[PDB]
Design a protein around this ligand. Sequence first.
Ligand SMILES: Nc1ccn([C@@H]2O[C@H](COP(=O)(O)O)[C@@H](O)[C@H]2O)c(=O)n1
Ligand SMILES: [Cl-]
Ligand SMILES: [Cl-]
Ligand SMILES: [Zn+2]
Length: 370
Amino acid sequence: KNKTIEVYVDRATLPTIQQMTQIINENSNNKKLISWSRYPINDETLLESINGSFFKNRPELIKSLDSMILTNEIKKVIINGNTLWAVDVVNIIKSIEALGKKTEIELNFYDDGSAEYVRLYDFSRLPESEQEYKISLSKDNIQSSINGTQPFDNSIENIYGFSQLYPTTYHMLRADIFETNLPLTSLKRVISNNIKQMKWDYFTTFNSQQKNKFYNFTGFNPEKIKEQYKASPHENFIFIGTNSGTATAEQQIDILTEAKKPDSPIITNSIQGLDLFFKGHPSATYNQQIIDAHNMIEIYNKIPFEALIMTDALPDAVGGMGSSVFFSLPNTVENKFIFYKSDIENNALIQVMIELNIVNRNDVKLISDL
Ligand SMILES: Nc1ccn([C@@H]2O[C@H](COP(=O)(O)O)[C@@H](O)[C@H]2O)c(=O)n1
Ligand SMILES: [Cl-]
Ligand SMILES: [Cl-]
Ligand SMILES: [Zn+2]
């Protein structure tokens, strides 16, 4: 009983990309069980190089996990998951504990995107006593879910409340959220020793083989985009697109025509004279309409922007639509404007982004502004 199994799960993309990067950085030979919704790995050479198995779904992964634990050889399981979707790690914990094999469990939660930060803002609006009360309930909430007596509510106090039960690290998009004007002292006390700031400078220390492993995992290689950046000597701008749940194609086309004016009263930070790139949202299907109307260099929409970040393929400047993308973007890239579908003072997404200095209050715009 000296073996550790590492479990990797995610429904989105950001935790997956960060999880891939940690696996590569650590280069451990522990057995790994992997289930990533957006990144099915069928590459057996890749999987063998990390000692991994891939599972198409959570119940299959759990089945293999449990049989391994039944061998009596498993000292510890490290579960790596998605904070918003902590429910998936709850069900993994439930299955391990049920077996009653005295398995050590340790947890790494990676933020999903903007949702955690919208929820943190909302939670910070609560009076302090109500925050403390919700927190007081969290340990029992989580334990009841693990015991199987109640469903799991992914409220702030619950998803950030696991360090009360297990050795837990929260890898956060912006760990410095607890150092803004938001009243979050109540939650900070719970997790202050359990927080890591997500890092994006791994490639600075990676050797070639590590870099190549990242390309192989993601199916992304930054060579084409890096050539596109340098093709012309002008500074590079990426427009961050959204999907129809937030904006129409026409509204984004209109935003781009306003931005191209050197003297807009709305978009004061002009994109005139820049090399313009369009990065579409992975789920948008109107990207060609926008790209054509503006003669923009296309960055394939299915590439998650965090792959651009991790591979150091960043532009000089950025602007566009309210998005999780802006939360992981390094602060060295200039943010010219963000448009929101939204009275901005009551908008949690806008306010958290202002508080984190992701965007100047003067550069926040509403789609109704054109
Ligand atoms: N233009 C965009 C918009 C979103 N995205 C990806 O989609 C994820 C979720 O973004 P949203 O919050 O915008 O839906 C981001 O973390 C990023 O991976 C992107 O890569 N390019
Ligand atoms: Cl350029
Ligand atoms: Cl769409
Ligand atoms: Zn140019």
